[PDB]
Design a protein around this ligand. Sequence first.
Ligand SMILES: COCCOCCOCCOc1ccc(C(C)(C)CC(C)(C)C)cc1
Ligand SMILES: COCCOCCOCCOc1ccc(C(C)(C)CC(C)(C)C)cc1
Ligand SMILES: COCCOCCOCCOc1ccc(C(C)(C)CC(C)(C)C)cc1
Length: 265
Amino acid sequence: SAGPQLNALPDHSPLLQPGLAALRRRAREAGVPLAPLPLTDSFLLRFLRARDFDLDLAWRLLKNYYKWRAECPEISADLHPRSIIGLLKAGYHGVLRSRDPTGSKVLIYRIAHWDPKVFTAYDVFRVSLITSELIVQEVETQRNGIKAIFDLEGWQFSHAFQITPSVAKKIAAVLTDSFPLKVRGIHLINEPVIFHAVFSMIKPFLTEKIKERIHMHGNNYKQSLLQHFPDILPLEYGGEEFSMEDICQEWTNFIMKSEDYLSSI
Ligand SMILES: COCCOCCOCCOc1ccc(C(C)(C)CC(C)(C)C)cc1
Ligand SMILES: COCCOCCOCCOc1ccc(C(C)(C)CC(C)(C)C)cc1
Ligand SMILES: COCCOCCOCCOc1ccc(C(C)(C)CC(C)(C)C)cc1
């Protein structure tokens, strides 16, 4: 249980240096790229915290992160938000202002606001990557992980058509062992009945990384979603203070302010 205690330290604690040294030596040895991603303490700590300072797992995650980036150029080859600013303006995606009861950052995606005649699955994936790279900078998010809510109202066949076996593989990767964020929960709301039926059959065979972390609320989601996310949801989902539009505009603004950092990858 040393791991979670190391996670709880600030980045400048000398106690994190043994793990950082051990990981940086493994990275260097396997010939990790020099390409505009510096192996700073703060960067490397993301991987250590994601795997509670288990060095072998932090290293495997780091390698898989590099592998995933190399394997998905149409997502990862340019992180400047200029390519997806329409999706953001359309209201596809926002991050809640407040954390949930266990301190997780909460992400919301709205499928009705993705026009598949305009944006590909890879554009939409680029949105998640951008957000991920931003939120991972907060040490509390590294410690407490994330939850994502997918509002599937208006899910159409044109959306489903974009999820090929290749896209499915890339989705599983980022949820499991290819990005330095702990996915503590995946919530679907307003999703078609077919999701439940499939899930009831495949659930027992899923990786334990996600198996017990998937919650499908269906159309009657208000009460159940509220139990997981009290006092932090937008008006549209049963919250009290701000609209989803406010959240989307606030997150969009933050992305644009970070445009040079995003490019610098
Ligand atoms: C889920 O089914 C709907 C299909 O949506 C389109 C597919 O592209 C969405 C990719 O979604 C994610 C979700 C989470 C993540 C990670 C695990 C990196 C965490 C996050 C959301 C904080 C970025 C990455 C991509
Ligand atoms: C072709 O359908 C694309 C819909 O994608 C939903 C987003 O999540 C992607 C995860 O991967 C799957 C898994 C199963 C399925 C279906 C519904 C087609 C079930 C199946 C193929 C196992 C019978 C679709 C996507
Ligand atoms: C009828 O609508 C047309 C398109 O149909 C899309 C298929 O929807 C059913 C898909 O069912 C699932 C259920 C679970 C999953 C897993 C658990 C693998 C991944 C998850 C949680 C990201 C959806 C994938 C597909």
